């Protein structure tokens, strides 16, 4: 019954967490790259993404063989709300092998207000920083 | 002007933002005594005592300026209806957040009715320090796609 664990205990962030509950059971996926280097990014809200990555909230899957690399874990979550957007952050991903000071990967998902959908249009923006975006009326105010 | 921490993509993005270079943005948050004024500029000096600052925090009680981020260390990304501008290399925290260098993150949302407006931090000095993250927002049709 594990959900998001806030990095630190902002109640403003806990309320934000309850506001996104409607997305907890949805699964977001997007595939970029081209054969044979196609990678599938699967993202979940406060639930585990991927098939072999316990605690991962967003994983990168090599389409060729299904090898999973954790980008972020929902047990190290941060969440902020702007005028018409919500920023979700998952820390504690797998460390880089020979890049970025070999630091733990991290996922940043920019959820934009879209009054015409509860959830949709998830995709990576630019892949020491993994940026993604998606639309949701939940990020509307 | 801005110095990328790089990318042709961010370079085009920097030029796409030129229309905002000579404007200055300010927003004051929190109430007496501990009120703070945040001054933000695009690829241009924002501080009065802080050289190379892209975004500064001014303690209103005494005028102490803190560099939140420098434009000589810029990063820029564009989403569907937003643009994320990042200024790293701000002054280090004194007794918070591992005493690491501050950085400013500004979320520019698409707004097809203003070239630029509604600049403000997403939280107050207090909350921002607690979260070890200085996040700001503003509107601009330049962030529209
Ligand atoms: C998150 O969960 C992972 C499980 O592998 C653990 O290693 C890590 O310490 C946890 N992070 C925190 C700070 O809770
Ligand atoms: C940015 O400028 C400051 C001087 O104010 C300097 O300390 C820092 O090393 C510079 N960073 C880069 C990108 O060279």
UniProtKB/Swiss-Prot annotation, chain B:
GO terms for cellular component: endosome; Golgi apparatus; late endosome; lysosomal membrane; perinuclear region of cytoplasm; trans-Golgi network. Glycans are attached at residues 22, 48, 59, 72, 78. The keyword Disulfide bond applies. GO terms for molecular function: protein domain specific binding; retromer complex binding. Keywords: Disulfide bond, Glycoprotein, Lysosome, Membrane, Phosphoprotein, Receptor, Signal, Transmembrane, Transmembrane helix, Transport. Disulfide bonds join 2-43, 97-132, 110-144. The keyword Lipoprotein does not apply. It is found in: Lysosome membrane. Residues 1-145 are lumenal. It is a single-pass type I membrane protein. Its main location: membrane. Residues 1-145 form the MRH domain. GO terms for biological process: lysosomal transport; protein targeting to lysosome; secretion of lysosomal enzymes. Transport of phosphorylated lysosomal enzymes from the Golgi complex and the cell surface to lysosomes. Lysosomal enzymes bearing phosphomannosyl residues bind specifically to mannose-6-phosphate receptors in the Golgi apparatus and the resulting receptor-ligand complex is transported to an acidic prelyosomal compartment where the low pH mediates the dissociation of the complex. Homodimer. Interacts with GGA1, GGA2 and GGA3. This receptor has optimal binding in the presence of divalent cations. The extracellular domain is homologous to the repeating units (of approximately 147 AA) of the cation-independent mannose 6-phosphate receptor. This is Cation-dependent mannose-6-phosphate receptor. It comes from Bos taurus (Bovine). The chain holds residues 33 to 182 of 279 of the full protein.
């Amino acid at each position: 019954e594990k959900t998001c664990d806030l990095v630190g205990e902002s109640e403003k962030q806990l309320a934000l967490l309850k506001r996104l509950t409607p997305l907890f059971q949805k699964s977001f996926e997007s595939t970029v790259g081209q054969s044979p280097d196609m990678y599938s990014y699967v993202f979940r809200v406060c639930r585990e993404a991927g098939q072999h990555s316990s605690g991962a909230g967003l994983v990168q899957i090599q389409k060729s063989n299904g090898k999973e690399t954790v980008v972020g874990r929902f047990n190290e979550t941060q969440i902020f709300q702007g005028s018409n957007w919500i920023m979700l952050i998952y820390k504690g991903g797998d460390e880089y092998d020979n890049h970025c000071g070999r630091e733990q990967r991290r996922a940043v998902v920019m959820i934009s207000c879209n009054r015409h959908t509860l959830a949709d249009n998830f995709n990576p923006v630019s892949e020491c920083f993994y940026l993604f975006e998606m639309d949701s009326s939940l990020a509307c105010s």
